[model samples]
Target: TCPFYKKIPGTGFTVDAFQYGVVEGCTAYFLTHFHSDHYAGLSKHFTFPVYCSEITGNLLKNKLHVQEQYIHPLPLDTECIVNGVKVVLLDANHCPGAVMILFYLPNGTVILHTGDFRADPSMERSLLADQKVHMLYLDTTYCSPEYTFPSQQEVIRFAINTAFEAVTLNPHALVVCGTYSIGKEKVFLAIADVLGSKVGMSQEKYKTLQCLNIPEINSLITTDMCSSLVHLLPMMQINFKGLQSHLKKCGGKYNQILAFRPTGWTHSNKFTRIADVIPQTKGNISIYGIPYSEHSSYLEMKRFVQWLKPQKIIPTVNVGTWKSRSTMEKYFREWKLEAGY
Candidate 1:
C-alpha cells in the first residue's frame, strides 16, 4: 500500500495526507493547506484536531463546514506544541493560508514539510534561518529539469498583456479567466484592478472570496455578467460544457469569448500537461494558458534543496509511483555528487 502519511516512528505525530487510523492514532494532526489533495476527507466531523494557520482554519470552517473545536489556528513563523512535539508554522508562498509545517522532535530531529509551495527568495531566507533541517518532506511536483519556468512577475505581466491583446482584438469579447477555487486568485485580483473591471464568480467562489476579506477582491467580485468584461471561473469550469452553459445564459450580449488559463505548465515539451495553458487559440473563443503557477519550478526546487541541505528528502506527492521515486533519488544523488552532503 502507498503510505500517504509517514509516521515519525518515535514521535506520536503525523504529517498531511493521513488515513483515519493515522488521524486517530497521532498525538496531533497537521494540515499544510486547504487544497483537496492535502485536505483528503477532513470536514466539520473530523475526529482528530487539526493544526494550521488561522486563514486555513477559517476556510476549513466556512468552506468545508468543519467543526470549530477541531481546528487549532497557529500563527505563521511561530512555535507551538502538539503534546510534547515542538512545532513551527511558516508561509508556504503558495496559495493563501498554505503553510510549511516544521516539527522539532524531542529526539533532536527537525522535520520540515513544504506543503505545495513556490520557493521564492524570502522563503529561502525563512527556511535557512535555523541553518539546519534534519528531514524534509518536499513537494516534488516539478522536480525535473524539463519543468523550468519564469518568475511569477513575468507570468503575471504576460497574462495581463495577453488579456489586453484578447480584449483589444475583440471589443465585445468576454474574457474568462481560469483559476483554482482558492489558488491563483492573485492573477485575477491584479487583472481586475488593472483592467478596472469587476469579475463574475460562481456562488461558491464569491462566498469564499468574501470570506478572504481582501478589499480589492471583494470590490472586484460580481454575479452580473454585464457588470464587467472579465469573468473569473474555476479552472475546471472553463471547458466546452462549461462554456456552453455560460453561453446559453449570456450569448447575445457578447460577440466572442476569450479564455485565460493562468497556470505554470507551459513550455513546448511538457506543454500539453493539464496545468500548462495554451498560449493562443484560433477560434471565436481564443484561449491562452499563462504560466502563473505558484509552485516551485524545477530549478527553484533544486536551489531550495541546495539551500536547506536536509539529511533525508521525502517526495511527498510521488510516494505512489516508482518513476517519481527514481527521479527523487536521482535528484538527491546528483545534488550530493555535485555538492556533498
Candidate 2:
C-alpha cells in the first residue's frame, strides 16, 4: 500500500486528503460580491451553503443562471446562521446587482469584507455598520500609493458639458458613448440630465437594475424607447454596432440622434480622440469620457490604504503593482502625519 499519511515528530499529524482518503473538516464558505474573483472559486472549492444579498441572488439566479441548492439569499444587515455560523449579505454597489459579505463568529469576532467598492456613496451603504468592526478583509485591490479617484460629481459635470456643447454645435449630430452597461449608467444620467432626456433599459437590463434598486438614481432610458419623445423631437436608443444604419432609420423625424455607448473599450479607449470617433460619425458625432471610474485612479489607492492603517498593505488587483509603490507610500506618509497615525 502507498504511504498516504506522514506522521510528524512534535505532534500527532497526518497527511490530509490528496488521494488516499476522503477529507472532512468543519469548514464554512461565504461569498463576497458576484465578481468573478470572489465567486469563481465557489463551485471548485466548497459545496457548503452559500449566502449573499438578495440582489446578488437575483443575478446569480438570472444572469449567471446557477442552479445550486445551498445558496441562501438574505438582505443587507439581516443576519442568519448556516452550520451555526452567523452571516449577513450586504449591498456592495461596485456595479448593478453587486454585494459584499460580513461575518460574525459565535465566539464574538466581527469581520467586514468590502468586496469591491467605489467612491460613490451608494457603495458606502454596503459597508454600513451599526458597531465598529474588529477586523476587515477590505477589497485591497487599490491599496497602492499611486492611484487617485476624482469626485463623481466632477466627472459627471465634465461629461455633460462636453456632450451638450458638442450637440449644440451639430444639429444633426449623433452622440456615441461606449461604457459598461451596468456601471456607466451614471454617465448616461449625466448625459440625460444635460440633454433633458432620460435613459431606459431593456427588460433584461431593467431586471438587473431592479435588483440594485437605488431609487435616488432612476434609469437613464425611457420606457417607450423614446417613441413618445419622437413626437417632441428626435430620440433613439444608445446602443453599439451598425451606427450608420441606426442613425439613418431614425432620422426623418428626429433632430439629433443620441448614442450613449460611444467609447466602446473594444473599439476605442479614453486616449482615443474625437477626431477618430467622429470620422465614422461623418463629422456629425460627439464623444465624451468622464472619469467616473469604479477603480481608483493612480493616487487615491494609496490614501485609502493609509486611512485604513493596515500594518503592511499589499496591492492585489493592480496590474502595475510595484511601479506604484513609491507614490502610494508618499501619500501614506503624508496621511499618517495628518491623521497622526
Candidate 3:
C-alpha cells in the first residue's frame, strides 16, 4: 500500500514522495538524497519547487538533468523558512547527499523525516537535541531484530584488510567491487586508498562521483582499465557468472578475480564481525558479500527512537500491509517504553 505519511500532516510539504507523482496540496517537495528509490518520479518536465541538500541539488541538475529553476539547494545545520514553515536539514549519514529533515509547523507541531538514514551516534548532538519531535517519519528498512551487522567502519576495515591480503598474495589479481550509482562509495574508496590502487570505472560513474566533489576522489579514479587493477561495477555484475565473463574479457592482464559485493543483505546476527563472513571461491575467482549497509540496523534505529522520544512514530518503508505496519509499531512500542516515555 502507498504510504499515508509521505506528506506531513499539517504542512503542505512532501518528503520523498515523487514516485507517487505530484502529491495533492504539496506546496514544496523535499528530496532526502540522490538515491533512485527516493527520487524516482522526479523529472525535468515537473515544475514544482524542490528543496534538498546542495550536493543532492548538484546531482539532480547534472545527473538527472532536472531544471535548475525548480531546485533549491538548502544548507545543512541551518534553519530556513519554507512556505511559512521552519525547516532545517541535518546530516543523514547514509549517502553523500542524504539528509534528515526537521519541520516546525506554525501550529507547534514538529516533524522529523529521516529519508533512509544510518542512525549514526553523532546525530544525538544535532539541533534536535533540545527540541521535541511530535512526529517522526522513519526509514525502517532493517527494523527486524536479526539485522545486527557490524559497524560501517568495521566492515570497511574488513574489506580493506581482505583486499590488501588477497592482492599482496597474488599481485596479478584484479579487485572488482560492487557498487550502486551513488551509495557504497566509502567501501571502495577505503579499499583503494589502503591498497594504493587506482579505481577504474565507466566515464558516466566517474562523472557522477565528480559531482560529489569528495576530496582526493578525482585523483584516485581512472577511466582506463589498463592502468588500474581495481575496478568498480554495478552489483549485478559481481556475481560468479558475471565475474567469469568479466575475467574472460580482461584476457591475460589479470590472473585471478577478487570481487566484493558489499551490502546489508549478506549480514545476519550470527556473525559479529564482517571479517568472519566466508567468501565463495570457484576456479580462479572469489567473491565476498560483505555486510556493508547504508541504512540503520534494528539496534541503531531503536537507539535513535529512544533518544528522540517522539510523540508519534511513522514508518516510511516495509509498510505495505497491516501485518507489516503492526510489526513495526510493536518495535516502536518497545523502544518508547525503553525510553521511559
> Distance from true position, residue 10, model 3, in Å?
2.1
* TM, every model: 0.90, 0.62, 0.96
Query: Whose TM-score is greatest here?
Result: 3
- Which residue pairs in candidate 1 have backbone atoms (N, alpha carbon, C) closer than 3 angstroms, thus clashing? 44-66, 44-67, 265-276, 277-289, 278-289
Q: Please report the TM-score between candidate 2 and the true structure.
A: 0.62
- The lDDT for every candidate, in the order shown, is 0.75, 0.48, 0.86
Give the alpha carbon lDDT tens digit for every residue of 30-69 in model 1.
7888778778767666767788888888888889888888
TM-score computed on alpha carbons, candidate 3: 0.96
Query: Candidate 1 at 305: error in angstroms?
Result: 0.8
* Candidate 2 weakest lDDT stretch, 10 residues: 7-16
lDDT of 2: 0.48
Candidate 3 overall lDDT versus native: 0.86
Residues 40-149 of candidate 2: C-alpha lDDT, one tens digit per residue = 43432334555566666666666665555755677666767656666666655466655555556666656555556653434334444254455544444555433344
Q: How many clashes (backbone atoms < 3 Å, residues ≥3 apart in a chain or on different chains) does model 1 have? A: 5
RMSD of each: 3.0, 8.7, 1.6
